[PDB]
């Protein structure tokens, strides 16, 4: 499957793509404002994620640090990134269907649109100013708006027992971005697409 990753933000982001135990394609790349990065993702990929990282510094060898979404200090992410990270999530070719969603379960750093470039389903978007509106206790100093599980590490926010409800914090994310997951047991906002669809992830879609 083809993913076009487009940075419409006025600032540079370092895109990342991983399935948790391996990079997807090159795994990461700098995207200046306006740049597009096309990656190929193996059919059948389960649990892939794409996110943006902000305020990164890397050396010759691709080692460094980012203020949001750092994946163990690598340019080319092999693992998932450190919150806060708005997440484009996808599982491809699952019994003939693709499943895509946007998630705020790991917080929010960059607004995002996640849309098919082929026929048969709709896209999803979280483009509200979540960082500007972020509750004081969830603000990340590096930038971004943390989720409550990351901040407070309770069974209720992290849904560790498999039973949990919405919270004042999850409702904040949900109020600004109804089409994104706001906590683990949120009513699913997953979109079902035809198997082997292609996609575009746009950072700052309303920029």
UniProtKB/Swiss-Prot annotation:
One of its GO terms (cellular component) is cytoplasmic vesicle. It comes from the Eukaryota. It holds the Pfam family Thaumatin. The keyword Disulfide bond applies. CDD domains: TLP-P. InterPro entries: Osmotin/thaumatin-like_sf, Thaumatin, Thaumatin_CS. Gene3D superfamilies: Thaumatin. Belongs to the thaumatin family. Taste-modifying protein; intensely sweet-tasting. It is 100000 times sweeter than sucrose on a molar basis. PANTHER family: OS03G0233200 PROTEIN. This is Thaumatin I. It comes from Thaumatococcus daniellii (Katemfe). The lineage of its organism: Eukaryota, Viridiplantae, Streptophyta, Embryophyta, Tracheophyta.
């Amino acid at each position: 499957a083809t993913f076009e990753i487009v940075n419409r933000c006025s600032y540079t982001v370092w895109a990342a793509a991983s399935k948790g135990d391996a990079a997807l394609d090159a795994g990461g790349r700098q995207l200046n404002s306006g740049e597009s990065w096309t990656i190929n993702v193996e059919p059948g990929t389960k649990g892939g994620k794409i996110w943006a990282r902000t305020d990164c510094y890397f050396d010759d060898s691709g080692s460094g640090i980012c203020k949001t979404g750092d994946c163990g200090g690598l340019l080319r992410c092999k693992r998932f990134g450190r919150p806060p990270t708005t997440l484009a999530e996808f599982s491809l070719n699952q019994y003939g269907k693709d499943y895509i969603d946007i998630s705020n379960i790991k917080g929010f750093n960059v607004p995002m649109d996640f849309s098919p470039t082929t026929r048969g389903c709709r896209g999803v978007r979280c483009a509200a100013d979540i960082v500007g509106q972020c509750p004081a206790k969830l603000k990340a100093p590096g930038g971004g708006c943390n989720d409550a599980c990351t901040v407070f590490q309770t069974s209720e926010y992290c849904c560790t027992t498999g039973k949990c409800g919405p919270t004042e914090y999850s409702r904040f994310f949900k109020r600004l971005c109804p089409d994104a997951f706001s906590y683990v047991l949120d009513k699913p906002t997953t979109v079902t697409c035809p198997g082997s669809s292609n996609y575009r992830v746009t950072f700052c879609p309303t920029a």
